[PDB]
From Swiss-Prot, chain A:
GO terms for molecular function: RNA binding; structural constituent of ribosome. Citrullinated by PADI4. The lineage of its organism: Eukaryota, Metazoa, Chordata, Craniata, Vertebrata. Keywords: Citrullination, Cytoplasm, Isopeptide bond, Phosphoprotein, Ribonucleoprotein, Ribosomal protein, Ubl conjugation. One of its GO terms (biological process) is translation. The modification Citrulline is found at residues 4, 15, 37. GO terms for cellular component: cytoplasm; cytosol; cytosolic large ribosomal subunit; cytosolic ribosome; focal adhesion; membrane; nucleolus; synapse. This is Large ribosomal subunit protein eL19. The keyword Cell membrane does not apply. It comes from the Eukaryota. Component of the large ribosomal subunit. Belongs to the eukaryotic ribosomal protein eL19 family. It is found in: Cytoplasm. Component of the large ribosomal subunit. The ribosome is a large ribonucleoprotein complex responsible for the synthesis of proteins in the cell.
Swiss-Prot record, chain B:
It comes from Homo sapiens. GO terms for biological process: negative regulation of apoptotic process; negative regulation of DNA-templated transcription; positive regulation of cell differentiation; regulation of translation; rRNA processing. This is Proliferation-associated protein 2G4. Isoform 2 is undetectable whereas isoform 1 is strongly expressed in cancer cells (at protein level). Isoform 1 and isoform 2 are widely expressed, including heart, brain, lung, pancreas, skeletal muscle, kidney, placenta and liver. Phosphorylated on serine and threonine residues. Phosphorylation is enhanced by HRG treatment. Basal phosphorylation is PKC-dependent and HRG-induced phosphorylation is predominantly PKC-independent. Phosphorylation at Ser-353 by PKC/PRKCD regulates its nucleolar localization. The lineage of its organism: Eukaryota, Metazoa, Chordata, Craniata, Vertebrata.
Swiss-Prot record, chain D:
Component of the large ribosomal subunit. The modification N6-succinyllysine is found at residues 38, 53, 58. This is Large ribosomal subunit protein eL31. It comes from Homo sapiens. GO terms for biological process: cytoplasmic translation; translation. GO terms for molecular function: RNA binding; structural constituent of ribosome.
UniProtKB/Swiss-Prot annotation, chain G:
It is found in: Cytoplasm. GO terms for cellular component: cytoplasm; cytosol; cytosolic large ribosomal subunit; cytosolic ribosome; nucleus. The keyword Transcription regulation does not apply. Keywords: Cytoplasm, Ribonucleoprotein, Ribosomal protein. Component of the large ribosomal subunit. The ribosome is a large ribonucleoprotein complex responsible for the synthesis of proteins in the cell. GO terms for biological process: cytoplasmic translation; translation. It comes from Homo sapiens (Human). The lineage of its organism: Eukaryota, Metazoa, Chordata, Craniata, Vertebrata. Belongs to the universal ribosomal protein uL22 family. The gene is RPL17. GO terms for molecular function: RNA binding; structural constituent of ribosome. It comes from the Eukaryota. Expressed in pancreas, lung, colon, cystic duct, gall bladder, kidney and liver. Expressed at high levels in the well differentiated pancreatic tumor cell lines HPAF, COLO 357 and Capan-1, the moderately differentiated pancreatic tumor cell lines T3M-4, AsPc-1 and BxPc-3, the poorly differentiated pancreatic tumor cell line MIA PaCa-2, and the pancreatic tumor cell lines of undefined differentiation status such as SW979. Expressed at lower levels in the poorly differentiated pancreatic tumor cell lines HCG-25 and PANC-1. Component of the large ribosomal subunit. This is Large ribosomal subunit protein uL22. The keyword Glycoprotein does not apply.
Length: 63, 354, 61, 107, 60, 50, 153
RNA sequence: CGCCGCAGGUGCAGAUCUUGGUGGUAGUAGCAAAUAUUCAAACGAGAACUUUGAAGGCCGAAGUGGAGAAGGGUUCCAUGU
């Protein structure tokens, strides 16, 4: 319903910004239940939350 | 469409087994309840034989789950019900001539068979018990006998309410305030179809109207008091808790998750008692109950010098006639009253049999 | 069980202090019950114990 | 019947001509929705997210001149709603737009 | 965790907890709440148990 | 600020506890003639003198 | 309560009202004037059309600055608008009035809006900020509304 | 309240009069400084604005980033309306 808290918690445990946190758009109810860490960590460990990769800034053109 | 009904021959037999297991446990206790005993000891031994007998039955099938549906609840001369102390609490030594109310539930594959009786302990041979206590429990039994005759699809729940009120007035007594008997089915104890005893304004405006339906389980109770019918709390720890599988909160305490894990494993949905653990049980309960993950069963005390009575049985509704599988050993020859029945309609329902 | 200043005035200071102590420990559990929910009965006995402490302290003073 | 699906090619260039830079791609997608509302007979046009990406593929002011889509009028017989028919328009990747007709795609 | 008077220092807090609860404490961490009342975290000695004591206190 | 004196924080403490709505049961008292806390304060609308 | 213009017969009539409704009084007064006298089904269909901007309401008294539209010719007039908020509040109050008619047992197929009036309500105060450190009002103009529907055919 | 006497802080259209309320203006001026939003879904009675995902963008390390000092004082955090 409203995952503002989970995004903040997931970014903190993932040690990444809120850009890089991916919450599963289909399993919104499951993430919405995770009101704490060790619940976010559980969701991270089973793949419902993924740290998105850094968008590529290649240096090949410069090289 | 997957709910189990009493239509099956195998289901009826074990339901007759549940009535036998309820009657045999009550019979074992009534003989073993005497003056100068430990109320805690009767509960542990009350549980003790109910563990073994439910383990030795049906040796050829050891797959389904069976056990307790409602803990051994006891209350003597001052409490309504929902009283079952822990080991740390002070014991209540049963004295001479007390009347004590005992409640117990047994579940087999989620089907609930629940019985509860009130009796006076250590009644000698040839004696005649008299007083205002001689009135309350006799009135309650006529509520039971009336209820047995009037339990049939077609007789409404509100007729049960007035009938119990009218006999209560006939016996100069009043039921305790706002209790609920329930219509039972598989894997449940808090059925939506409930019948209410001794209601008031808030109760009658929020209670439901419904007609008794066939092939159903009815856990009928009668709670009658000799005084005013009002109860409150005197700061005694609430022990009996039941989980609700509807709502959910994510526990943050290791003991609460462990307490909630152990509750789900052993007493998934039926009301349990904190005697089944104790150091970690008490501190895990506060967090779960705070977030209403468990619905409590508090203790209710009456006034000093007030007496309360209770009778509960489970009955199965067949089209041809109800049969009460669980009963308590009450006799009218050793127990009389000074006021009698005055209403003609009450007369008809007691002389008629089934 | 109520105490009165009139009957407290005969005792010595040895059990007057003793009576003040268990009166203080009783108020300690009373405030504990107030925090942990407790009951309406226990909350109402907070004042009756507070005035009993003042009564005993007034007599010794 | 009423479940049919067809394949169209919309000249966005013609429908978008004259629109300012910061409102071109936004206008292109309400022109697809207007196009679908007309060719099919139904309101409540549902635009596929892949179709969204194709219109925005080259930014906000350089919209593709033409796009090939597939309108699918399907039954809304899934929940109580005012409209019983809805059209879902998907994106069809193509190499050329030459000699492309409006064709009836089968099941 | 207790609520104590703002005029009591960690030494009196340790002495009060030790004497009126019959326990041995390891250290006291104190802070004053925004409400204006002191909050004392009393770490018990390893041979004592907080849950054991909190039962006897009644705050379990 | 984070750096405060004791007496300032004690001053701020009292102002916090008395910025609370009146109890609902006050309305039921005989001869009440009180309706709301008219001395309520909001941190953004009106500032403490200190 | 005391409605103005009580019905001729409070047995084939139904009433509804609302007070302190957060709608513009000028927009609702025009909307009620067009609705007045309409049959219940014609008025309900018309108010949905105004929301859909397929039919308009003519602004006759409070028209200063109101623009012109083509649809304001059905009503002999020039300027009209499509007050969405006024239509929704009148639709809600018409639905309440219809349920009252079925409550006292008259058919809703033959209901006609005999009387409908909109009254100014107490204004609500807000603040706007002007150039040289000046404070100016930002008052709202709510409205009381009430109508009587008469069963007639 | 009338009648005989007594005594006045005794009569309003104005004073750019004091206080309060209300109009026309007027559904009007206006809600135009700093490039920009779009698609689907969820909750929900209700979605241009909430949340999730996808895309297109902007700040571009002298930041629209991360922390503090004064100042504020609970605005911090959960849950609900
Ligand atoms: Mg410090
Ligand atoms: Mg400011
Ligand atoms: Mg003009
Ligand atoms: Mg301004
Ligand atoms: Mg200024
Ligand atoms: Mg004058
Ligand atoms: Mg005057
Ligand atoms: Mg004047
Ligand atoms: Mg304008
Ligand atoms: Mg503008
Ligand atoms: Mg840039
Ligand atoms: Mg906040």
């Amino acid at each position: 319903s409203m995952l503002r808290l989970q995004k903040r918690l997931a970014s903190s445990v993932l040690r990444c910004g809120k850009k890089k946190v991916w919450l599963d758009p289909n399993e919104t109810n499951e993430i919405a239940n995770a009101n704490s860490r060790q619940q976010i960590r559980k969701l991270i460990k089973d793949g419902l939350i993924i740290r998105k990769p850094v968008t590529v800034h290649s240096r090949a053109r410069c090289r | 469409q997957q709910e189990q009904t009493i239509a099956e021959d195998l289901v009826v037999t074990k339901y007759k087994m549940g009535g036998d297991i309820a009657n045999r446990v009550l019979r074992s206790l009534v003989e073993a309840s005497s003056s100068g005993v430990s109320v805690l000891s009767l509960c542990e031994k009350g549980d003790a034989m109910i563990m073994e007998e439910t383990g030795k039955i049906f040796k050829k099938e050891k797959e389904m789950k069976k056990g307790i549906a409602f803990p051994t609840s006891i209350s003597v001369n001052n409490c309504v019900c929902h009283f079952s102390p822990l080991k740390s609490d002070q014991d209540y030594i049963l004295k001479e001539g007390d009347l004590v109310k005992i409640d117990l539930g047994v579940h087999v594959d989620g089907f609930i068979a629940n019985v509860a009786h009130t009796f006076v302990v250590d009644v000698a041979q040839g004696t005649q018990v008299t007083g205002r206590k001689a009135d309350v429990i006799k009135a309650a039994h006529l509520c039971a006998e009336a209820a047995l005759r009037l339990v049939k699809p077609g007789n409404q729940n509100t007729q049960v309410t007035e009938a119990w009120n009218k006999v209560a007035h006939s016996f100069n007594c009043t039921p305790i305030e706002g209790m609920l008997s329930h219509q039972l089915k598989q894997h449940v104890i808090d059925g939506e179809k409930t019948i209410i005893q001794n209601p008031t304004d808030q109760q009658k405006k929020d209670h439901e109207k419904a007609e008794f339906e066939v092939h159903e389980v009815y856990a009928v109770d009668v709670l009658v008091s000799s005084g005013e019918g009002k109860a409150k709390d005197a700061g005694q720890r609430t022990t009996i808790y039941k989980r609700d599988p509807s709502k959910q909160y994510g526990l943050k305490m290791k003991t609460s998750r462990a307490f909630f894990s152990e509750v789900e494993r052993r007493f998934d949905a039926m009301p349990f008692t904190l005697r089944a653990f104790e150091k970690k049980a008490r501190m895990g309960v506060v967090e779960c109950a705070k977030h209403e993950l468990l619905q409590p069963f508090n203790v209710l005390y009456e006034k000093e010098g007030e007496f309360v009575a209770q009778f509960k049985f489970t009955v199965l509704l067949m089209p041809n006639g109800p049969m009460r599988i669980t009963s308590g050993p009450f006799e009218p020859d050793l127990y009389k009253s000074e006021m009698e029945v005055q209403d003609a309609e009450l007369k008809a329902l007691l002389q008629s049999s089934a | 069980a109520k105490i009165k200043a009139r009957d407290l005035r005969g005792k010595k200071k040895e059990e007057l202090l003793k009576q003040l102590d268990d009166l203080k420990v009783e108020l300690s559990q009373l405030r504990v019950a107030k925090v942990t929910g407790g009951a309406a009965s226990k909350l109402s006995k907070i004042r009756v114990v507070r005035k009993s402490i003042a009564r005993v302290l007034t007599v010794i003073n | 019947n009423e479940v049919v699906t067809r394949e169209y090619t919309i000249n966005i260039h013609k429908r978008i001509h004259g629109v300012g830079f910061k409102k071109r791609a936004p206008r292109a997608l309400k022109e697809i929705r207007k196009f679908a509302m007309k060719e099919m007979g139904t309101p409540d046009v549902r635009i596929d997210t892949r179709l969204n990406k194709a219109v925005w593929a080259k930014g906000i002011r350089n919209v593709p001149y033409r796009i090939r889509v597939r309108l699918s009028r399907k039954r809304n017989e899934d929940e109580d709603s005012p409209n019983k028919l809805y059209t879902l328009v998907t994106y069809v990747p193509v190499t050329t737009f030459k000699n492309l007709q409006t064709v009836n795609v089968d099941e | 965790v207790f609520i104590v008077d703002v005029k009591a220092n960690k030494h009196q807090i340790k002495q009060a907890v030790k004497k009126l609860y019959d326990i041995d404490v390891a250290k006291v961490n104190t802070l004053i709440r925004p409400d204006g009342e002191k909050k004392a975290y009393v770490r018990l000695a390893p041979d004592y148990d907080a849950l054991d004591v909190a039962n006897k206190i009644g705050i379990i | 600020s984070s750096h405060k004196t004791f007496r300032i924080k004690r001053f701020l403490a009292k102002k916090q506890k008395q910025n609370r709505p009146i109890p609902q049961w006050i309305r039921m008292k005989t001869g009440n003639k009180i309706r709301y806390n008219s001395k309520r304060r909001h941190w953004r609308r009106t500032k403490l003198g200190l | 309560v005391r409605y103005s213009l009580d019905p001729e017969n409070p047995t084939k009539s139904c009433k509804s009202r609302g007070s302190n409704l957060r709608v513009h009084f000028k927009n609702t007064r025009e909307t009620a004037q067009a609705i007045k006298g309409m049959h219940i089904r014609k008025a309900t269909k018309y108010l949905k059309d105004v929301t859909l901007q397929k039919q308009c309401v003519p602004f006759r008294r409070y028209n200063g600055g109101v623009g012109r539209c083509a649809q304001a010719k059905q009503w002999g007039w020039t300027q009209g608008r499509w007050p969405k908020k006024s239509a929704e509040f009148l639709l809600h109050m018409l639905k309440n009035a219809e349920s009252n008619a079925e409550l006292k047992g008259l058919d809703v197929d033959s209901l006609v809006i005999e009387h409908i009036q909109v009254n100014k309500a107490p204004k609500m105060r807000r603040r706007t900020y002007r150039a040289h450190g000046r404070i100016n009002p930002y008052m709202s103009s709510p409205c009381h509304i009430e109508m009587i529907l008469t069963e007639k055919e």
